[PDB]
């Protein structure tokens, strides 16, 4: 048992919010810098459920035309898909049918989740009443936002329920192994003291929802 792996392809336009969703799920952080990806980046994610561990291999692809690389050569042997669009720009939503078309012509009968990112921005341009693609294609739609962690775990939960088959599936708490006990050289201890001083000097970012 290779802890049950699956291949997930993340597709969408330029801004959208991929590689920020994946980065928030990987380490936990918000990237405010936009650096377009070249080709694809493969990141493993693990979740724990009442049936055991489930591992996704997220293939975060590039939504830019000139950085596409192997455009559709990534959606081969894929087993699940996420189509992401930005709710603050209607062009990102107009291209959802094209991404779906490119997905279906290479993969047959795979679970696909449609996600609308950047909900928290306000002055939203794609109102929730105008999102009808999931109704037409029998898809599962979610409103997420990687900044506020709103519904940010729902797509993986839905895909986990669909892939093994258990409409009553939950994320159980990750096992907590015993951390090791080690020691450091006194010079590195003094360096850590100086780093602690300079960190305590620095001010934490101002946020909320604690």
């Amino acid at each position: 048992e290779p802890q049950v792996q699956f291949k997930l392809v993340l597709v969408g336009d330029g801004g959208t919010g991929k590689t920020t969703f994946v980065k928030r799920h990987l380490t936990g952080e918000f990237e405010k810098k936009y650096v377009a990806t070249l080709g694809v980046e493969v990141h493993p994610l693990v979740f724990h459920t009442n049936r055991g561990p489930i591992k996704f291999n997220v293939w975060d692809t590039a939504g830019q035309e000139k950085f596409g690389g192997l455009r559709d050569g990534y959606y081969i042997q894929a087993q699940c898909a996420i189509i992401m669009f930005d709710v603050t720009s209607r062009v990102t939503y107009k291209n959802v049918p094209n991404w779906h078309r490119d997905l279906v012509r290479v993969c047959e009968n795979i679970p696909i989740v449609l996600c609308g990112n950047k909900v928290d921005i306000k002055d939203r341009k794609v109102k929730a009443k105008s999102i009808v693609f999931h109704r037409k294609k029998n898809l599962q739609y979610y409103d997420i936002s990687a900044k506020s962690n709103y519904n940010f775990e729902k797509p993986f939960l839905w895909l986990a329920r669909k892939l093994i088959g258990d409409p009553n599936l939950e994320f159980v708490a990750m096992p907590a192994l015993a951390p090791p006990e080690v020691v450091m050289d006194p010079a590195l201890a003094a360096q850590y003291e100086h780093d602690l001083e300079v960190a305590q000097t620095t001010a934490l970012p101002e946020e909320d929802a604690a």
Partner: protein, 144 residues
């Protein structure tokens, strides 16, 4: 769509490995990590959720075991040693800053500069008091 197939496993037994340990404290907090590898200093988020101070049943080792909300993935897991002292942040009464040499959140030890923040000053003071009690207990244990 649908992909319900064979890889559906059994139920097994779920063990959080927090057994054999007494929960001395539990509070909602937010964690930050100091990014000291990307040349210029910067503070990165690490998670939001319940931080606990778990004391081992017979070994008497106190550890911090914060977890993330709605995903239940560990964002902090390390022991407490006598040298660890909570320091106030820059003009904040609800945040503490400390340093550790072996953090096991990613199942690989990494030195970390952590900063925890609470909802109000009362929770911060309770956490600091319990942290000081645990540190003093560890120091007394190791002294003997």
């Amino acid at each position: 769509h649908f992909q319900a197939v064979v890889p559906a496993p059994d139920e097994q037994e779920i063990a959080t490995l927090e057994e054999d340990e007494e929960e001395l404290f539990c509070n909602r907090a937010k964690l930050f990590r100091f990014a000291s590898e990307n040349d210029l200093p910067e503070w990165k988020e690490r998670g939001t959720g319940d931080v606990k101070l778990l004391k081992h049943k017979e070994k008497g080792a106190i550890r911090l075991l914060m977890r993330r909300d709605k995903t239940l993935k560990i964002c902090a897991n390390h022991y407490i040693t006598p040298m660890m002292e909570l320091k106030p942040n820059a003009g904040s009464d609800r945040a503490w800053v400390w340093n550790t040499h072996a953090d096991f959140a990613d199942e690989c030890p990494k030195p970390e500069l952590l900063a925890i923040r609470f909802l109000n000053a009362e929770n911060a003071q309770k956490f600091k008091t319990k942290f000081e009690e645990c540190r003093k207990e560890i120091e007394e244990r190791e002294k003997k």
